[PDB]
Design a protein around this ligand. Structure first.
Ligand SMILES: [Cl-]
Length: 19
């Protein structure tokens, strides 16, 4: 659910950085 690199999100495309 974000534009950043990181882990895939559960329910939306895009990724997130934990923390
Ligand atoms: Cl992915």
């Amino acid at each position: 659910g974000t534009l950043t690199p990181g882990l895939p999100e559960d329910f939306l495309p895009g990724h997130y950085m934990p923390g």
